[PDB]
RNA sequence: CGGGGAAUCAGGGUUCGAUUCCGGAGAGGGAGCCUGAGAAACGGCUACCACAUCCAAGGAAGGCAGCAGGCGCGCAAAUUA
RNA sequence: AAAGUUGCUGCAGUUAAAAAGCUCGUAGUUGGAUCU
RNA sequence: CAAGACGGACCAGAGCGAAAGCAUUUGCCAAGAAUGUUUUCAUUAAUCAAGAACGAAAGUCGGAGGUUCGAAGACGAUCAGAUACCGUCGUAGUUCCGACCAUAAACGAUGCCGACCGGCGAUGCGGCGGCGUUAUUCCCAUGACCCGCCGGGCAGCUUCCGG
RNA sequence: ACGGUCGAACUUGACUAUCUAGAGGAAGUAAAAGUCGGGUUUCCGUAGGUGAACCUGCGGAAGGAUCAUUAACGG
């Protein structure tokens, strides 16, 4: 079993940290290899340039084409794919456009039908997609 | 060597035949290790290519 | 090997109480075991016992009353201060009305209530209820 | 007792860890000056030392008295 | 259980409660002590002396009659050996196993049992060094062991 | 940067603490000084390294991690009162 | 925090993830009564 | 007649060994458990990072030897498409000696030491107590059985102990 | 001005680490309906058979579905 002596403190804490390294979330947070593979680089949001528009095919039980965008982030040059949520909202996006992107909700994990998309478009040309969709504001170019 | 080992063979024939067999096995294992290495390298590069296709250049437009 | 003879004695008492028996033989004997049984006797929990005085470590046969639920040891013998005795009696005891932390202090082996009365702390030995 | 007129002693203690409520064994070595008035000092006997001013790069204490080992007559 | 075996046996002595010398035993402590002295002069370990005294002379326990145990009497007069009895027997057993392994090289079980005997020798030597019975510079070495016996 | 401390929490714990209080360090980077009770000081000096201002082309003058303010950087932060 | 899914309090290790092929052995940890 | 191999049946839920494993006779060699002891020492202990011995089969180096079997390999059959199965031969190997390797479903898919909590009678070894049958009634002990009891074992059955 | 001291930094090779252009090679992807077309109970370790899978050899497991017989042995 466990050691329960009055002098077993360093054995307990050493075994604790060694088996702490076997925790998946702990190893994601503390090893520092997931943070450098993360394109946002420990940021809630990133801002990039639209490279192209992509139709991503939905996974097996669902049949749909999800309108996504290949973006290159400004601060590190990495390339990501971001989902444009509502219907007709890809038409508000043009090529070589300035776009604010956030994660999609599962912390770097792909969500739902879309294979390999962790990000969603929040703002297009420094105006929100919500205000464009609801028709509150107009978009410059 | 694909030859029967009869009874009349003595020393300096049996040992030479055995040494030839041992050499055949030796370069045979060397070639086997080289094949393992080449197939491993090819599998790593094709998995890299498949993951690159998963990340980008896969869509309609 | 046999370490902590108090743990063996308390486990034997618990196991034969759970079985419904009337008497328990526990070997070896010690001063700590006799003091623990004296404390546990004064609260009417166990009954009265004989120390079979062989020339080795003695034996004890203790009568059993059906009033015991659980008697137990705490290993290791942690240091308990009066500021920390409330947490121990919250952790180990089923209720605030009954149950007993036995502890050894420089005033002797006693209960947590007598330790509060005499304003002393010590090292924990057990609990029974 | 190998360098000239100073010795290395070891002080042992238990450091408390609050999470596990336990202890760990720790030690520290000290170089302390040993005067020639304490001769026939052996290895493994208890020494009482007193703090003084720095005497070298590492020596800060000085041997005050020597009590022999538990087994040594 | 055993130190180096899987066995957990119960074969041992059981002294009685009665520490008093039996009334039929018409031997004083001095007679038993001189008997111990002459048996040691004949040359016997204290186990052998105790067995001879128990079997033939009717002495149930030496320390119940004389008040002192055999090896302390031998040390007090001065016939105690320099190395202890059990350590001597272990070293002798190790020497015999080493001789067998010198004769027979492929005997792996003899090597394994020799390793166990050396472990027991080192344990006893450490214990005797703590009690200042052996000198602190004492050591068991592979080559010069048969000289000690 | 370290503490005082903060969030959360039955009990035990986990995590945060650049940030107004105390202590340390440094003024683009290193190095050497003068004065002085006190500085290896930079709203003092002298160099080299990197930047960069005015030139009549010989020379001269620099140091906002002070207050506002500007550029840049970025998901990210205010008035030259 | 939920997470007794890092478990000191307080987790697991037949079949679900898991006990080293086996033994010896140093440091470490723990160590039977007994003295008003 | 010779060669190398292998020790069947007896052979069991029997035994021994740390495990891997271990079965022809006899002799020699050192070990070992258990039991028995009113022997001796008197805490000398348990579990163990580092370190160290042993570790099936297969495989690799040197030598010896190759009976059987036999990966590879060569043939013969078999079919819309057969290239695994099947049969004959057969190399490394399978055997021994000396060096390496340190792996198995290396299994009880169950760490070791210690304590307590139901029962029963078979077996292995040792010890104890016995009325009897047998060594052609044995002259006394001793071996083989028979009835119990104790200690350590390999296992079994039974149970609504508790999980 | 000689000398000493503290010492920024400069040059030369090695060990490197980073930034930044590249002829070429090997690829994949979107565009061409263009041309030709039966075996296995389940495994483990090692070795061979073209790398893996799979098969075979050697040694191991069950994590694989026990029916029937068994009181005499003395003359």
Swiss-Prot record, chain A:
Covalent cross-link (Glycyl lysine isopeptide (Lys-Gly) (interchain with G-Cter in SUMO2)), residues: 36
Compositionally biased residues, Basic residues: 1-19
InterPro entries: NA-bd_OB-fold (IPR012340), Ribosomal_uS12 (IPR006032), Ribosomal_uS12_euk/arc (IPR005680)
Pfam families membership: Ribosom_S12_S23
Positions where N6-acetyllysine occurs in the chain: 134
Post-translational modification: Hydroxylation at Pro-61 affects translation termination efficiency.
Organism superkingdom: Eukaryota
Broad class of the protein's primary localization: cytoplasm
Signal peptide from the UniProt entry: none
One GO molecular-function entry: structural constituent of ribosome
Keywords: Acetylation, Cytoplasm, Deafness, Disease variant, Dwarfism, Endoplasmic reticulum, Hydroxylation, Isopeptide bond, Nucleus, Ribonucleoprotein, Ribosomal protein, Ubl conjugation
Subunit structure of this chain's protein: Component of the 40S small ribosomal subunit. Part of the small subunit (SSU) processome, composed of more than 70 proteins and the RNA chaperone small nucleolar RNA (snoRNA) U3.
PANTHER family tied to this protein: 30S RIBOSOMAL PROTEIN S12 FAMILY MEMBER (PTHR11652)
NCBIfam families named among the record's database cross-references: PRK04211.1 (NF003254), uS12_E_A (TIGR00982)
Protein name: Small ribosomal subunit protein uS12
Organism: Homo sapiens
Gene: RPS23
UniProtKB/Swiss-Prot annotation, chain B:
Stretches of the chain forming a coiled coil according to its record: 5-61
Highest rank taxon of the organism: Eukaryota
Region Disordered: start-end pairs: 1-34
Ranges of compositional bias, category Basic and acidic residues: 6-34
Protein's cellular compartments: Cytoplasm
Tissue expression: Expressed in the epidermis.
Family: Belongs to the LTV1 family.
Disease: Inflammatory poikiloderma with hair abnormalities and acral keratoses: An autosomal recessive disorder characterized by mottled hyper- and hypopigmentation of the skin, sparse scalp hair and eyelashes, sparse or absent eyebrows, and palmoplantar keratoses.
Function: Essential for ribosome biogenesis.
Listed name of the protein: Protein LTV1 homolog
Organism per entry: Homo sapiens
Gene that encodes the chain: LTV1
Shown residues in whole-protein numbering: 414 to 474 of 475
From Swiss-Prot, chain C:
Residue positions, PTM N6-succinyllysine: 87
Gene Ontology CC terms, in alphabetical order: cytoplasm; cytosol; cytosolic ribosome; cytosolic small ribosomal subunit; extracellular exosome; membrane; nucleolus; nucleoplasm
UniProt entry tagged with the keyword Isomerase: no
Keywords associated with the record: Cytoplasm, Diamond-Blackfan anemia, Nucleus, Ribonucleoprotein, Ribosomal protein
GO biological processes: cytoplasmic translation; positive regulation of cell cycle; positive regulation of cell population proliferation; response to virus; ribosomal small subunit biogenesis; translation
Subunit structure, as described in the record: Component of the 40S ribosomal subunit. Part of the small subunit (SSU) processome, composed of more than 70 proteins and the RNA chaperone small nucleolar RNA (snoRNA) U3.
Disease implication from the record: Diamond-Blackfan anemia 20: A form of Diamond-Blackfan anemia, a congenital non-regenerative hypoplastic anemia that usually presents early in infancy. Diamond-Blackfan anemia is characterized by a moderate to severe macrocytic anemia, erythroblastopenia, and an increased risk of malignancy. 30 to 40% of Diamond-Blackfan anemia patients present with short stature and congenital anomalies, the most frequent being craniofacial (Pierre-Robin syndrome and cleft palate), thumb and urogenital anomalies. DBA20 inheritance is autosomal dominant.
Family: Belongs to the universal ribosomal protein uS8 family.
Protein name per UniProt: Small ribosomal subunit protein uS8
Organism: Homo sapiens (Human)
Gene, per the UniProt record: RPS15A
UniProtKB/Swiss-Prot annotation, chain E:
Modified residues (N6-succinyllysine): 26, 33
Residues the record lists as Phosphoserine modifications: 29
PROSITE patterns, A to Z: RIBOSOMAL_S15 (PS00362)
Cross-link (Glycyl lysine isopeptide (Lys-Gly) (interchain with G-Cter in SUMO2)): 42
Keyword Phosphoprotein recorded: yes
InterPro entries in the record: Ribosomal_uS15, Ribosomal_uS15_arc_euk, Ribosomal_uS15_N, uS15_NS1_RNA-bd_sf
Quaternary structure annotation from Swiss-Prot or TrEMBL: Component of the small ribosomal subunit. Part of the small subunit (SSU) processome, composed of more than 70 proteins and the RNA chaperone small nucleolar RNA (snoRNA) U3.
Protein name, UniProt field: Small ribosomal subunit protein uS15
Gene of this entry: RPS13
């Amino acid at each position: 079993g466990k050691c329960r002596g009055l002098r077993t403190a360093r054995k307990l804490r050493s075994h604790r940290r060694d088996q702490k390294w076997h925790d998946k979330q702990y190893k994601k947070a503390h090893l520092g290899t997931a943070l450098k593979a993360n394109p946002f680089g420990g940021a809630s949001h990133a801002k990039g340039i639209v490279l192209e528009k992509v139709g991503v095919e939905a996974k097996q039980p669902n049949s749909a084409i999800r309108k996504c965008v290949r973006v290159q982030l400004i601060k590190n040059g990495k390339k990501i794919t971001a989902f444009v949520p509502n219907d007709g909202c890809l038409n508000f996006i043009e090529e070589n456009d300035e776009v604010l992107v956030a994660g999609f909700g599962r912390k770097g994990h792909a969500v739902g039908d879309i294979p390999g998309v962790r990000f969603k478009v929040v703002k297009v040309a420094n105006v929100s997609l919500l205000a464009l969709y609801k028709g509150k504001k107009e978009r410059p170019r | 060597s694909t030859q029967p080992r009869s009874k009349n063979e003595s020393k300096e024939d049996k040992r030479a035949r055995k040494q030839a067999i041992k050499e055949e096995r030796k370069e045979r294992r060397v070639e086997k290790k080289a094949n393992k290495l080449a197939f491993k390298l090819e599998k790593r590069r094709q998995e890299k290519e498949l993951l690159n296709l998963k990340k980008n250049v896969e869509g309609l437009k | 090997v046999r370490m902590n003879v108090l743990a063996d004695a308390l486990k034997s008492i618990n196991n034969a109480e759970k079985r419904g028996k009337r008497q328990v033989l526990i070997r070896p004997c010690s001063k700590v075991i006799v003091r623990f049984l004296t404390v546990m006797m004064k609260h009417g929990y166990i009954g009265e016992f004989e120390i079979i005085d062989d020339h080795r470590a003695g034996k004890i046969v203790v009568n059993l009353t059906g009033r015991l639920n659980k008697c137990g040891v705490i290993s290791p013998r942690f240091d308990v201060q009066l500021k920390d005795l409330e947490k121990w009696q919250n952790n180990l005891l089923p209720s605030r009305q009954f149950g007993f932390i036995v502890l050894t202090t420089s005033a002797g082996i006693m209960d947590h209530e007598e330790a509060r009365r005499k304003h002393t702390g010590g090292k924990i030995l057990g609990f029974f209820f | 007792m190998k360098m000239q007129r100073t010795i290395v002693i070891r002080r042992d203690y238990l450091h408390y860890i609050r999470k596990y409520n336990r202890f760990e064994k720790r030690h520290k070595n000290m170089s302390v000056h040993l005067s020639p008035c304490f001769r026939d000092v052996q290895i493994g006997d208890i020494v009482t030392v007193g703090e003084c001013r720095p005497l070298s790069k590492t020596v800060r204490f000085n041997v005050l008295k020597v009590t022999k080992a538990a087994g040594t007559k | 259980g055993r130190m180096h075996a899987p066995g957990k046996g119960l074969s041992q002595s059981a002294l009685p409660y009665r520490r008093s010398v039996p009334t039929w035993l018409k031997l004083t402590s001095d007679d038993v002590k001189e008997q111990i002295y002459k048996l040691a002069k004949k040359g016997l370990t204290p186990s052998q002396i105790g067995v001879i005294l128990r079997d033939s002379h009717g002495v149930a326990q030496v320390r119940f009659v004389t008040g002192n145990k055999i090896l302390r009497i031998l040390k007090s007069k001065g016939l105690a050996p320099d190395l202890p009895e059990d350590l001597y027997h272990l070293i002798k057993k190790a020497v015999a196993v080493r001789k067998h392994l010198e004769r027979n090289r492929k005997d792996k079980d003899a090597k394994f049992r020799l390793i166990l005997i050396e472990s027991r020798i080192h344990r006893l030597a450490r214990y005797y060094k703590t009690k200042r019975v052996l000198p602190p510079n004492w050591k068991y070495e592979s080559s010069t062991a048969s000289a000690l016996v």
